[PDB]
Design a protein around this motif. Sequence first.
Motif, PDB file in Angstrom:
ATOM      1  N   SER A 120       0.792  -1.212   0.000  1.00  0.00           N
ATOM      2  CA  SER A 120       0.000   0.000   0.000  1.00  0.00           C
ATOM      3  C   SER A 120       0.826   1.263   0.000  1.00  0.00           C
ATOM      4  O   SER A 120       0.271   2.352  -0.008  1.00  0.00           O
ATOM      5  N   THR A 121       2.156   1.135  -0.004  1.00  0.00           N
ATOM      6  CA  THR A 121       3.020   2.294   0.042  1.00  0.00           C
ATOM      7  C   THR A 121       2.865   3.137  -1.210  1.00  0.00           C
ATOM      8  O   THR A 121       2.847   2.604  -2.344  1.00  0.00           O
ATOM      9  N   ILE A 122       2.749   4.449  -1.000  1.00  0.00           N
ATOM     10  CA  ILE A 122       2.815   5.435  -2.055  1.00  0.00           C
ATOM     11  C   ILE A 122       3.981   6.355  -1.729  1.00  0.00           C
ATOM     12  O   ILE A 122       4.152   6.689  -0.564  1.00  0.00           O
ATOM     13  N   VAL A 123       4.816   6.680  -2.703  1.00  0.00           N
ATOM     14  CA  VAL A 123       5.925   7.619  -2.503  1.00  0.00           C
ATOM     15  C   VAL A 123       5.717   8.795  -3.421  1.00  0.00           C
ATOM     16  O   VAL A 123       5.506   8.641  -4.620  1.00  0.00           O
ATOM     17  N   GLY A 124       5.768   9.971  -2.853  1.00  0.00           N
ATOM     18  CA  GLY A 124       5.517  11.195  -3.560  1.00  0.00           C
ATOM     19  C   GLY A 124       6.716  12.102  -3.501  1.00  0.00           C
ATOM     20  O   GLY A 124       7.540  12.000  -2.586  1.00  0.00           O
ATOM     21  N   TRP A 125       6.816  12.965  -4.500  1.00  0.00           N
ATOM     22  CA  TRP A 125       7.735  14.069  -4.493  1.00  0.00           C
ATOM     23  C   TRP A 125       6.990  15.389  -4.609  1.00  0.00           C
ATOM     24  O   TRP A 125       6.019  15.525  -5.382  1.00  0.00           O
ATOM     25  N   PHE A 126       7.420  16.328  -3.768  1.00  0.00           N
ATOM     26  CA  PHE A 126       6.920  17.697  -3.771  1.00  0.00           C
ATOM     27  C   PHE A 126       8.105  18.657  -3.916  1.00  0.00           C
ATOM     28  O   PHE A 126       9.264  18.256  -3.765  1.00  0.00           O
ATOM     29  N   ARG A 127       7.833  19.904  -4.224  1.00  0.00           N
ATOM     30  CA  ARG A 127       8.921  20.886  -4.209  1.00  0.00           C
ATOM     31  C   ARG A 127       8.452  22.198  -3.660  1.00  0.00           C
ATOM     32  O   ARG A 127       7.329  22.632  -3.970  1.00  0.00           O
ATOM     33  N   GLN A 128       9.265  22.778  -2.780  1.00  0.00           N
ATOM     34  CA  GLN A 128       8.972  24.084  -2.221  1.00  0.00           C
ATOM     35  C   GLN A 128       9.722  25.126  -3.007  1.00  0.00           C
ATOM     36  O   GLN A 128      10.913  25.372  -2.778  1.00  0.00           O
ATOM     37  N   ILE A 129       9.022  25.707  -3.962  1.00  0.00           N
ATOM     38  CA  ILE A 129       9.481  26.870  -4.696  1.00  0.00           C
ATOM     39  C   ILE A 129       9.613  28.023  -3.703  1.00  0.00           C
ATOM     40  O   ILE A 129       8.796  28.143  -2.810  1.00  0.00           O
ATOM     41  N   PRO A 130      10.683  28.832  -3.823  1.00  0.00           N
ATOM     42  CA  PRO A 130      10.867  29.889  -2.822  1.00  0.00           C
ATOM     43  C   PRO A 130       9.628  30.752  -2.604  1.00  0.00           C
ATOM     44  O   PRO A 130       8.991  31.189  -3.572  1.00  0.00           O
ATOM     45  N   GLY A 131       9.232  30.927  -1.341  1.00  0.00           N
ATOM     46  CA  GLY A 131       8.047  31.718  -1.019  1.00  0.00           C
ATOM     47  C   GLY A 131       6.729  30.986  -1.154  1.00  0.00           C
ATOM     48  O   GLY A 131       5.681  31.566  -0.842  1.00  0.00           O
ATOM     49  N   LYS A 132       6.743  29.741  -1.638  1.00  0.00           N
ATOM     50  CA  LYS A 132       5.505  29.025  -1.904  1.00  0.00           C
ATOM     51  C   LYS A 132       5.369  27.795  -0.997  1.00  0.00           C
ATOM     52  O   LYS A 132       6.305  27.410  -0.296  1.00  0.00           O
ATOM     53  N   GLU A 133       4.182  27.190  -1.027  1.00  0.00           N
ATOM     54  CA  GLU A 133       3.951  25.917  -0.349  1.00  0.00           C
ATOM     55  C   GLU A 133       4.722  24.807  -1.014  1.00  0.00           C
ATOM     56  O   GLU A 133       5.173  24.963  -2.136  1.00  0.00           O
ATOM     57  N   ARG A 134       4.879  23.680  -0.342  1.00  0.00           N
ATOM     58  CA  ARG A 134       5.265  22.446  -1.014  1.00  0.00           C
ATOM     59  C   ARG A 134       4.212  22.082  -2.090  1.00  0.00           C
ATOM     60  O   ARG A 134       3.025  21.908  -1.804  1.00  0.00           O
ATOM     61  N   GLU A 135       4.641  22.057  -3.353  1.00  0.00           N
ATOM     62  CA  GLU A 135       3.782  21.769  -4.487  1.00  0.00           C
ATOM     63  C   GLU A 135       4.055  20.377  -5.032  1.00  0.00           C
ATOM     64  O   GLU A 135       5.206  19.956  -5.121  1.00  0.00           O
ATOM     65  N   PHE A 136       3.004  19.674  -5.406  1.00  0.00           N
ATOM     66  CA  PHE A 136       3.129  18.302  -5.849  1.00  0.00           C
ATOM     67  C   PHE A 136       3.922  18.218  -7.155  1.00  0.00           C
ATOM     68  O   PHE A 136       3.709  19.031  -8.035  1.00  0.00           O
ATOM     69  N   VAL A 137       4.806  17.228  -7.247  1.00  0.00           N
ATOM     70  CA  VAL A 137       5.593  16.930  -8.450  1.00  0.00           C
ATOM     71  C   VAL A 137       5.109  15.611  -9.073  1.00  0.00           C
ATOM     72  O   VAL A 137       4.683  15.570 -10.229  1.00  0.00           O
ATOM     73  N   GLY A 138       5.129  14.538  -8.299  1.00  0.00           N
ATOM     74  CA  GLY A 138       4.668  13.266  -8.841  1.00  0.00           C
ATOM     75  C   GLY A 138       4.647  12.212  -7.761  1.00  0.00           C
ATOM     76  O   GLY A 138       5.165  12.430  -6.679  1.00  0.00           O
ATOM     77  N   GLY A 139       4.020  11.096  -8.065  1.00  0.00           N
ATOM     78  CA  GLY A 139       3.947   9.976  -7.154  1.00  0.00           C
ATOM     79  C   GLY A 139       3.998   8.633  -7.849  1.00  0.00           C
ATOM     80  O   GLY A 139       3.757   8.515  -9.055  1.00  0.00           O
ATOM     81  N   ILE A 140       4.323   7.630  -7.048  1.00  0.00           N
ATOM     82  CA  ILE A 140       4.363   6.241  -7.486  1.00  0.00           C
ATOM     83  C   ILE A 140       3.665   5.363  -6.461  1.00  0.00           C
ATOM     84  O   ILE A 140       3.804   5.526  -5.224  1.00  0.00           O
TER      85      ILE A 140
END
Length: 129
Positions: free
Chosen positions: A30-50
């Motif tokens: 059931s594991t899901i692994v995600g990547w997010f990125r915190q653009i300067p000044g912004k929230e952590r924004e979704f990049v992708g998942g598996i």
Amino acid sequence: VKLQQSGGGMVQTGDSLRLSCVGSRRALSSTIVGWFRQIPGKEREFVGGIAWSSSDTWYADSVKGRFTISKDDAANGVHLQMSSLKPEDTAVYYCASALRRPGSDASDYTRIPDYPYWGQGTQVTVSSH
Ligand SMILES: O=C(Nc1ccc(Cl)cc1)Nc1ccc(Cl)c(Cl)c1
Ligand code: NA
């Protein structure tokens, strides 16, 4: 589970970088692994998942085709291959993980609170030549 990420640093426009994220405990079905990125000044924004069991992937529009998440063949981790980088991709990249709720599609896991477990972040600055 604890998540451990590889290093980042400064790269140049057009370059590629392959980040690693490794879990302290073996993936579950059931594991899901995600990547997010915190653009300067912004929230952590979704990049992708598996989704670990199926290897299904889903991505944000801003990285589609350029960034690829894959399961490691010989470790308990994933890679984020980041290609054709541009200055706008400057951010702290975060690995995160979740355990999929029955009845909830893995590709619904695109928001920060969907993931309880977070890596420490990998800071990447992309600059023009
Ligand atoms: O989540 C995992 N594994 C895992 C493996 C690799 C990556 Cl990149 C991310 C996560 N297992 C697990 C195992 C036991 C428990 Cl209690 C929990 Cl909460 C989680
Ligand atoms: Na933004």
